[PDB]
């Protein structure tokens with residue numbers, strides 16, 4: 001059937017759902033491979049982060065979408081790793097597509113991460129285990145800052161902020177390495193490593209340009 005949902009990416013080894021539900025006074029977290037156990041949180045009056053790792057499980061993605069009222073067109077986008085980053089506003093929910101690097105001491109993998117803010121839930125969809133969101137998990141666990149007091153829109157902002165922070169750290173590491181090569185480090189191979197890094201840097205740099213543009217120009221317009 002043409003309408004068949006297809007995962008377009010290359011990761012198929014992991015599957016797991018992690019739920020963190022909290023309010024100013026409490027917090028409960030669990031991991032499960034049973035999707036039926038996370039569906040009840042749909043109607044939660046308090047914020048719930050539902051992190052679905054392994055979107056190759058198109059059956060799980062479809063079940064979550066059907067229960068939460070996600071449009072099939074959005075499930076196609078979640079499953080298509082060639083989507084562009086975006087924020088899109090549906091009558092009853094916000095849909096966001098992001099990209100995220102996974103780091104390990106060149107070379108660096110890229111993975112798409114989608115978010116849906118619906119009612120009081122942030123649904124997160126990842127391709128494989130491993131992400132940049134631990135700082136947010138810890139602030140929830142240990143009741144740091146104000147995240148525990150705020151609603152699910154703040155959870156959404158906090159997760160995006162964690163990804164922004166990761167990119168800025170990543171650009172800093174890329175710059176420190178280019179420097180190391182530029183002033184140090186036989187010569188012909190050293191130069192081609194540099195090229196590799198300056199290209200990766202060119203890929204990430206637009207994020208900083210978009211953010212700096214918003215930061216500089218919006219606030220005064222708001223006044």
Ligand SMILES: CCCCCCCCCCOC1OC(CO)C(OC2OC(CO)[C@@H](O)[C@H](O)[C@@H]2O)[C@@H](O)[C@H]1O
Pocket residue numbers: 156157158160161164165168
């Ligand atoms: C649209 C909805 C969602 C929006 C979410 C909000 C996005 C927030 C972006 C801001 O994060 C940063 O704030 C800085 C200041 O402008 C940074 O400079 C800095 O980077 C550091 C972190 O390593 C520290 O050395 C200092 O805080 C230093 O000011 C930079 O790191 C960056 O991470």
Ligand SMILES: CCCCCCCCCCOC1OC(CO)C(O[C@H]2OC(CO)[C@@H](O)[C@H](O)[C@@H]2O)[C@@H](O)[C@H]1O
Pocket residue numbers: 087094096117119120151152153156
């Ligand atoms: C990268 C950019 C991302 C931008 C994200 C934008 C976030 C938008 C959410 C803000 O507005 C809302 O916040 C709620 C909790 O999350 C609400 O609960 C609600 O408020 C109501 C009563 O006023 C009713 O409409 C419903 O019960 C509804 O769920 C409702 O105010 C909703 O519109």
Ligand SMILES: CCCCCCCCCCOC1O[C@H](CO)[C@H](OC2O[C@H](CO)[C@@H](O)[C@H](O)[C@@H]2O)[C@@H](O)[C@H]1O
Pocket residue numbers: 081082083084085086099206207210211
């Ligand atoms: C604050 C939010 C982010 C700010 C900074 C934005 C950084 C640049 C974003 C662009 O990323 C992409 O560019 C495409 C196209 O321009 C993609 O679609 C596509 O997939 C391809 C490659 O994956 C292309 O070959 C196709 O033409 C097709 O359009 C897609 O992969 C996506 O990753």
Ligand SMILES: CCCCCCCCCCO[C@@H]1OC(CO)C(OC2OC(CO)[C@@H](O)[C@H](O)[C@@H]2O)[C@@H](O)[C@H]1O
Pocket residue numbers: 085098099100109110111112160163164203204207
């Ligand atoms: C407000 C926060 C917003 C955060 C989101 C915006 C991030 C800015 C874009 C940077 O990340 C990319 O998107 C890809 C798709 O995930 C890439 O494709 C890739 O580049 C390659 C070429 O070497 C392959 O090796 C990789 O596997 C991979 O598919 C990756 O290079 C880079 O273009």
Ligand SMILES: [Mg+2]
Pocket residue numbers: 073076077
């Ligand atoms: Mg689409």
Ligand code: NA
Pocket residue numbers: 111126127128129130131
């Ligand atoms: Na991941």
